[model samples]
Target chain A: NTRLRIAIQKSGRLSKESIELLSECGVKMHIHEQSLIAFSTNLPIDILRVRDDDIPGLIFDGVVDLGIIGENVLEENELERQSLGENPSYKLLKKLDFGYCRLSLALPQENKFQNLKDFEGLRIATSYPQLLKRFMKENGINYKNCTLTGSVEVAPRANLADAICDLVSSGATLQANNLKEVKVIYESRACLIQKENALSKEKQALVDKIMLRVAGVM
Target chain B: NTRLRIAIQKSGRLSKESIELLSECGVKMHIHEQSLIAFSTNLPIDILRVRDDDIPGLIFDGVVDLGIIGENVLEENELERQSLGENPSYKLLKKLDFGYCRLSLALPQENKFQNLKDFEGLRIATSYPQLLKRFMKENGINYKNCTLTGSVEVAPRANLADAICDLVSSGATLQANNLKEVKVIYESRACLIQKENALSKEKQALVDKIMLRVAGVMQARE
Candidate 1:
């Protein structure tokens, strides 16, 4: 008799897409402008809106049965959880076609970047320290990381780091900061994920119905 | 020939106050929106706008010759630097009479706050950990400290701390978060501070003239 709990980003590029996706699936929802919790009037679903960083953990903890998140965050979190030897697995239910961006490793525009081999012993500022660390390990490059939660673009000018890894959409912020995108570490889009294990008969029936509506609209 | 370096809060309740004070002292400035550097037309001063947390350090590091900062942050940084074996001293040039707030210990409204001794062993989230730690030490009580830069009011709600020590102006933020002020740890106002070292004759003359203008403005207030 428990209603389905769905987690989504509170606000950002992904919020509009998430709401639109649900609406296209014929799930009518009246989202209260100020509240993080939204209710679907026609369906037995409750939406929990939170920061994008918290979405992965919400699903991983099973607090929400389903979540819509960006692939970069999902992959980075999954990798971090795995590194800690934790059993982190989720079903990739669907990849919603929206919220696209590239995570790139960048350097000062003055630095001549030929390839990945030039990253040795350099300090990089990023919010995604774990992801950057993983990327370095995969490419056999060693670098120091300055974990800045925001304002990664200014880190180089501030003398905190020599380079940066950040989310680049239009390349405006990087260019304004005199940083050149050297290499793309990952390309990401919005995706829906479901918790592991079988759903109840009612929930499974609901999912099937929703999927049909989704296909028809698309 | 030296351009006077004056550091002020880049953005906050105190930023506008500091700028207004500078203008009142006959320093005409054309501010570039959100830029660190502001050019003064009437005086040979270059304003270095930065984070409030960095103002005290800027003066102490001799990077900026003068700074306008909140006393709450100023004393806390001084206590921390002193503990770390640094001689943290500055000349209090003037109190600008803006940016008034209090640092207070707060608890959930549902709990009963008895006395300072009641805070023993309770975890408190605060931006000014040094000040909070000093208070606890003076009261002969041991408390856990959770250093949070922002959103300290939500710490107790999220179970990150048992209580909180945060800057409260009107007590609305704490009330909205279901918190009640328990103890006033620090009362603060905006102040202009100068480095303790001697200034060149020209710089000293400029400082004296600025101070005279500031004094005249005070007379206007009366």
Candidate 2:
């Protein structure tokens, strides 16, 4: 017997929204705070709780049939894999309502606001390097990248970089760090996705049924 | 006058020990749970709480004059910086007495692991890629690395990797995941470090004073 598998973030801002979405869709799950795997009690489905960044690759590799992840992370991973000459295609199942954020270029609050050209020779730090690079290239802006996995907001204060490209949810983190958002590079929301390869007939029908319930809940 | 700054982990296994070590050394710091920066009440010092991985770079860049971090993270960043052609030298001020862990290569409990050679051509997942790479290179083992920033322990069961190389503190996580540690690649402890560039004379004296206090505290623990 085969069961549908779905991947979702284990923690962070999106995890709560993801689980709530499933509950609203009538999928009963027992989610232990620290456990990485959970199975639906009412449906033939398994949920693989993982780090948000890992969900993209898991879907791309077909390790999981479906996933709920932020568009920013999904696109960044897609670009990274594409650079490695790997096909990172996936089907967007739905655009969820929560976990909204924007990727923005920011600088120290005291710095005078200028056009994009002002950032040409500056060093910018970020967690989403791939996404930042993509935006920079599109805008024809050139700069050195100082990548940090976390604490991107403090990079300028620590003298690690002249600017930063990071996700801004409420802008409080930026304000607290004495940084000001300079440019909005991308907007993101949580999205449901499926692997490029087709699912089995039975699994596909189950996914269709869940999609209907999700629409009703939304 | 510039106050001395010390960087420490914001959170993790080492975070608690770091704060306790500072308190034991008689540093009166009001550490707020959510704040990134803490100012000492009695000393002219600032504590920059940050991600564990960021401490090495902060020291190497001289953004912070001192730091308490894991040896595993320090060396991993050093090797990575070296490969990038950057100088990552720092002074090992002291090896603190807490946060003991080991980096080990592990496989599924059902797999027969005879030797390091058994890992050849297998895919291994890890957060510390540089450390894992160095160990694999030394052993002449060839393998693919699936870099996951977190959740290395679950990679094997997810079919994302054939094995894992990760930090193990109590071996309970490994056993829970149905994995067995076959090779220990590195041993780690929390350490105190300073920038390679010399501190100001006054700052140097302050550091010397603090080192004495740290030694006293460590001795008391032992």
Candidate 3:
């Protein structure tokens, strides 16, 4: 199929916004409840519903033409790829002004940090280990990493790590888990990105047409 | 607090069975809806509810005293550790019959495989990459790996992979996705496992007492 394929998060905070944004861009779809692949009813485009973390690699691998993902995740994947001595490449089409959040360094409420020195060698749990390691290295702070895919807020209570570097949206989960955000490591927003390779003129025209609609919608 | 810490799956097939098995072994507890850690009222034991994949690492790291996990996961973790030049070690106490399942290699129904050789050098998506790699190596069949944490069954349709190695419990998921199980790589049942280091006398006594109750329950089930 020559249709343009775009991957979006299938669940969590960005899923709803992504669907809404696409429809706002006039890419209407008839999606099934459990469908992993959805086709636009009005355009020659396809939507690939998948795990959020998989979007970056999909675009990098050129399996999909475009993707919608948070900047935190996008940068994390890039850093990890480059760390492994591979060229990390992509094109950011636009920032969609939704899915706003921050990747932060946090500690238990009963505890505190006095500058980066206090946390020099503390073990910090995070899903975005690459991003955290990059930030800490740039600041000359050495730390141990406890990698976890989920439930990062409860790291201190679980005794898995002394601190946490996790995404903070409403700050409710952090407070509920008795942790307070101490430093903002990275601010994130949902953004549209395209694959590295140039598209066919027909596909490029399709993309150009949608960009006009997106500019109008935003 | 030196309470014996036991890790169990926070969700999915084995969760309820693990909880029920513990209570039947005379350990009673009240768990909260969102609580990650629960304490038993009658025994000096604590329950750490976590993801199933994390359970093996917690045991291997000695962060938890014991874990209830499927055999497929146990072997997968062991293989991964050994591949990384780390010691793969654990002690299985008993095999609980609940949480029965299999990790099977499947292909889309529109296509078929004659035998293992038919799938040589095919791309296979899997959550259990280590297990699949090991099995394919043993059979002298080479396969490209596309690692995914979930949704392995839909890989063929998505064009990400030619086949999949995924957990099949009721087989409904496979049939629903228009795939058929061709080969089962690993047969699995929930098993009890303990950390490597020997437990202190008090903890050993607690474990022994529960083993007796478990033995009684299995006999009754038999």
Q: Each candidate's DockQ score against the native complex?
A: 0.05, 0.19, 0.24
Q: A134-200 in candidate 3: lDDT tens per residue?
A: 8999999998766667788877887768899999999999989889999999999999999899999
**Candidate 1 residue runs with Cα over 4 Å from true position:** A1-218
Please provide, for model 1 over B1-222, each residue's C-alpha lDDT reduced to its tens digit, 9 standing for 90 to 100. Answer: 287878888788799888988898889998977576676998888887777877786677555678899999999888766765568778999987688999999999999877888888887878787799888888899987665556678767655568999999988999899999989989999998998888788887888888888889878867
lDDT values of the candidates?
0.80, 0.87, 0.85
Candidate 2 lDDT, A1-218, residue by residue in tens: 38888889998989888999998988999989645668799999888888898889878867678999999999998987776556788999999999899999999999997799889978888888789988899989899766667877877765557999999999999999999999999999999999889999999999999999999888
Task: For residue B221, give model 1's deviation from the true position in Å.
Answer: 2.0
Best by lDDT: 2
Best by TM-score: 3
Q: With candidate 3 superimposed using the best TM-score fit, by how many Å does residue B39's alpha carbon deviate from the native?
A: 1.4
* Candidate 3 lDDT over residue span B1-222, tens digit each: 468889898888889999999998889998975767787999899898888887787777566788999999889978766664568577889999798999999999988678989788787878887799889999999877666667778878877678999999999999998999999989999999998989999998888888899999888877
DockQ of 1: 0.05
- Model 2, residue B18: distance off in Å is 2.1
Better of 2 and 3 by DockQ: 3
Better of 1 and 3 by DockQ: 3
Query: What shift in Å separates residue B33 of candidate 1 from its native position after superposition?
Result: 2.6
Total clashes in model 2, counting residue pairs 3 or more apart in sequence or in different chains: 0
